[PDB]
């Protein structure tokens, strides 16, 4: 789970002599920055 | 260099005014990193990348493209050298160059500057190949390294102790084409030693050494300066900026290069489109707005076709052109092997940006899709991955664009899913009575089938090896070709007897009728209910 997922189709390799060049993509574990809460007060009667 | 680790058959073509590379040259393109390296911005670069990111699976293959400009590079003159750079265009004005003098050993230094990219490489201790040191008891150790005054090139290395030559080493075409051969042979001397510099590998060809004139060694690490010869070694083969030769080399202050020019777009792009002719293309799309350039693409495709290498193109329609404009553009260029695009929208590009789309970018993305799809596969109903679409054509109005041969896109709302698919692969050739012209993939299979038939005839009978080549063997060979194309579903059938031949010599006339893999299109349902 250190990386969420990877697009295997978007990985490419090129080779020349004794050198390889590689491109890739990774989805990082996405972080969670902010929350905001609307708290509204209301009233309704208790009855007997 | 240290060993370490570090962290389709149909060719597509494009043309635009790129912000990088050399003008008027065709480039083989394969990876967006290479694109980004060689080009910085411009609609060609967007077009290349969107073509690779055009469909959820399908993608353009190799791309052939050229920078359509009369541009120039930036440059400046000072001293015996002219400062030269690889950047064409008016952007080359931003290049900053200069030279300074080293405090350690009186050497030269180059700092190649481009602060808009935060580029700041340095080529350190330019010159100073090796030191001569002395250890004899005589008065002083003078030595010279003398130029040919007609060419300013070295001819000898001469050590003079007191005022007489102990031993010199002559560069006049002997064994001493290399400076390190002079090192080993100074070290053979009793009173002198020579030692190569530790500041990188500076082996230097002897014909590029420079002036020394009775410099004293006896209490100095006198370097053989070689200021010119090591400039070529370090600066020529690296970086963005290099020095060419027109006076003497001199230092000079921080200076911006001049002369960089982009140039205006020319009225005619046909001279620069012929550059793509022998290079093997198949699908090509323009980017400019004028119909003038589209008429040239349509001439190039027909000229290559009659040469023997048929091609196909697609044409865009700018921003929000309507029916009245489309029927005047299509009619003006109503030849086959051209398609006109009528719809534009929004593309969320791979670089994150949400661009409003000119229809030329849609024609690119459609071209890339068509190259990505297999031979004889139709672009019909395939997704194009447009984010949102700007269309004002309903069911009936789309049929008039289908009648007029103008490709268009339809948003399809499934029960709670929306996706954008192209309606049909109809070409600009309006008349429906020829399907090989009317329909893109029907013609693409025909072009392949004819080329490969010729490719085999180029051996079988174009060798004209004997007058024993009866027409009865010509009929057979044709049926052998048809049998193979029939066996792997490349044709639907062939008429098992109807091949006929006319022979007179090297000349032999051949006709054939073949049944294509015809394509289904239309359905109508009559639903009924009871109870």
Q: Rounded to whole angstroms, how far apart are CA atoms B399 and B29?
A: 38
Documented resolution in Å: 4.5
CB B122 within 8 A of CB B109: yes
CB B112 within 8 A of CB B130: no
Mention every residue, 6+ apart, whose C-beta is less than 8 A from residue B203: B178, B179, B180, B196
Q: Rounded to whole angstroms, how far apart are CA atoms B40 and B50?
A: 15
CB pairs under 8 A between A and B: 8
B30 CB neighbours in chain A (<8 A) are 14
CB contact under 8 A, B33 and A14: no
Q: Rounded to whole angstroms, how far apart are CA atoms B286 and B279?
A: 17
Report strand pairing: B81-88 vs B241-245.
Answer: antiparallel
Q: Residue B43: in which H helix or E strand, if any?
A: helix B43-52
Residue B389 sits at φ, ψ, to 5 deg, of -135, 145
Q: Which of B3, B31, B57 sits opposite A12 (nearest CB)?
A: B31
Q: Rounded to whole angstroms, how far apart are CA atoms B329 and B326?
A: 5
Q: Rounded to whole angstroms, how far apart are CA atoms B14 and B44?
A: 7
Burial of B268 (0-12, 13-18, 19+ CB in 10 A): exposed
Residues of A with CB under 8 A from a CB of B: 9, 12, 14, 18, 23
Q: Which of B5, B6, B31 to mutate to test the interface with A (most CBs of A within 10 A)?
A: B31
**B513 in contact with chain A, both atoms CB, cutoff 8 A:** no
Q: Rounded to whole angstroms, how far apart are CA atoms B398 and B418?
A: 18
| Local structure of B13: helix, strand or coil | strand
Q: Of B108, B103, B164, which Cα lies nearest the Cα of B138? A: B164
Hey, CA dihedral for B102, B105, B107, B112, is it positive or negative?
negative
Q: Of B486, B492, B485, B481, which Cα lies nearest the Cα of B518? A: B492
Q: Rounded to whole angstroms, how far apart are CA atoms B373 and B57?
A: 10
The DSSP output letter for B287 is -
B402 alpha carbon, distance to own chain's centre: 36
Residue B265's CB is within 10 A of a number of other CB atoms, namely: 15
Q: Rounded to whole angstroms, how far apart are CA atoms B348 and B25?
A: 30
| Local structure of B268: helix, strand or coil | coil
The DSSP output letter for B37 is H
Q: How far is CA B214 from CA B22, B188, B256, in A?
A: 47, 21, 38
Token pair 């006929």: residue: B500
Q: How far is CA B515 from CA B293, B377, B477, in A?
A: 37, 17, 18
Structure tokens at B167: 């031993």
Report strand pairing: B26-29 vs B12-16.
Answer: unpaired
Structure tokens at A40: 């509204």
Q: Which of B2, B28, B33, B54 to mutate to test the interface with A (most CBs of A within 10 A)?
A: B33
CB contact under 8 A, B57 and A9: yes
Q: Which of A9, A18, A23 sits opposite B31 (nearest CB)?
A: A23
Structure tokens at B235: 């600066």
Residue B189's CB is within 10 A of a number of other CB atoms, namely: 18
CA dihedral B209, B214, B217, B223 (to 10 degrees): -20
Q: Residue B457: in which H helix or E strand, if any?
A: helix B440-460
Residue B262 sits at φ, ψ, to 5 deg, of -90, -50
Mention every residue, 6+ apart, whose C-beta is less than 8 A from residue B139: B161, B162
CB B474 within 8 A of CB B510: yes
- Name the residue in chain A with its Cα closest to that of B7: A22
Q: Rounded to whole angstroms, how far apart are CA atoms B345 and B355?
A: 9
Query: Length of chain B, please?
Result: 531
Q: Rounded to whole angstroms, how far apart are CA atoms B160 and B165?
A: 4
**B34 in contact with chain A, both atoms CB, cutoff 8 A:** no
Q: What is the DSSP string of B171-237?
A: -SSSS-SBHHHHHHHHHTSSSEEEEE-SSS----BGGG---EEEEE-TTS-EE---HHHHHHHHHTT
CB B21 within 8 A of CB B45: no
| Elucidation method | cryo-EM
Burial per residue of A11-44, b for 16 or more beta-carbon CB atoms within 10 angstroms, e otherwise: eeeeeeeeeeeeeeeeeeeeeeeeeeeeeeeeee
């Amino acid at each position: 789970n250190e990386i969420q997922d990877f697009p295997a189709e978007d990985v490419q390799v090129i080779v020349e002599g004794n050198e390889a060049r590689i491109s890739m993509t990774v989805y990082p574990i996405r972080s969670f920055k902010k929350i905001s809460v609307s708290l509204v007060y209301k009233q309704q009667t208790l009855q007997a | 260099t240290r060993p370490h680790a570090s962290i389709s058959e149909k060719v597509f073509c494009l043309i635009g005014q790129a912000e990088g590379g050399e003008p008027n040259t065709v480039y083989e393109l394969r990876n967006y990193s290479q694109a980004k390296r060689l080009f910085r911005s411009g609609e060609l670069l967007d077009a290349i990348e969107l073509a690779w990111g055009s469909n959820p699976n399908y993608t353009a293959g190799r791309i052939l493209a050229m920078r359509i400009e009369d541009a120039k590079p930036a440059s400046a003159e000072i001293g015996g050298l002219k400062i030269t750079s690889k950047i064409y265009g008016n952007v080359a004005n931003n290049i900053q160059v200069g030279l300074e003098k080293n405090t350690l050993s009186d050497s030269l230094r180059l700092r190649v500057i481009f602060q808009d990219d935060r580029f700041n490489e340095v080529y350190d201790n330019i010159g100073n190949i090796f030191t001569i040191k002395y250890k004899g008891e005589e008065a002083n150790a003078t030595f010279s390294v003398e130029h040919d005054e007609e060419t300013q090139k070295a001819s000898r290395l001469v050590l003079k102790v007191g005022d007489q030559e102990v031993k010199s080493y002559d560069l006049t075409g002997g064994a001493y084409d290399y400076t390190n051969a002079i090192i080993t042979d100074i070290n053979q001397l009793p009173d002198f030693e020579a030692k190569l510099s530790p500041f990188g590998d500076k082996n230097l060809e002897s014909s590029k050494l420079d002036k020394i004139e009775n410099a004293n060694i006896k209490d100095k690490a006198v370097y053989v300066k070689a200021v010119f010869g090591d400039l070529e070694k370090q600066t020529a083969y690296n970086g963005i900026v290099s020095f060419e030769q027109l006076k003497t080399i001199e230092p000079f202050e921080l200076t911006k290069l001049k002369g960089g020019t982009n140039g205006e777009p020319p009225a005619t792009w046909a001279d620069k489109l012929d550059k793509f002719a022998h290079e093997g293309g198949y699908y090509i799309v323009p980017l400019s707005s004028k119909q003038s350039v589209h008429a040239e693409v349509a001439s190039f495709v027909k000229e290559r076709s009659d040469a023997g290498e048929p091609m196909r193109a697609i044409v865009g329609g700018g921003f929000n052109e309507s029916k009245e404009q489309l029927f005047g553009r299509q009619a003006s260029l109503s030849n086959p092997r051209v398609s006109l695009v009528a719809n534009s929208g929004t593309f969320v590009m791979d670089d994150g940006r949400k661009n409003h789309v000119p229809a030329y970018m849609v024609a690119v993305a459609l071209g890339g899709l068509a190259s990505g799809l297999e031979i004889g596969e139709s672009i019909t109903f395939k997704p194009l991955r447009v984010s949102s679409l700007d269309q004002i054509y309903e069911s009936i109005d789309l049929d008039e664009l289908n009648e007029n041969g103008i490709i268009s896109i339809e948003f399809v709302r499934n029960r709670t899913n929306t996706f954008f698919r192209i309606v049909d692969d109809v070409t600009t050739f309006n008349d429906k009575s020829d399907p090989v012209k009317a329909e893109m993939a029907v013609g693409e299979a025909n072009d392949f089938l004819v080329s490969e038939l010729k490719v085999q005839l180029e051996d079988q009978f174009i060798g004209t090896r004997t007058i024993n080549t009866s027409a009865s063997i010509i009929k057979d060979f044709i049926q052998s070709y048809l049998g193979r194309k029939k066996r792997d579903n490349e044709i639907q059938d062939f008429p098992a007897e109807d091949v006929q031949v006319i022979v007179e010599g090297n000349e032999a006339r051949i006709s054939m009728t073949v049944y294509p893999i015809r394509s289904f299109k239309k359905i109508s349902v009559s639903l009924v209910y009871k109870q």
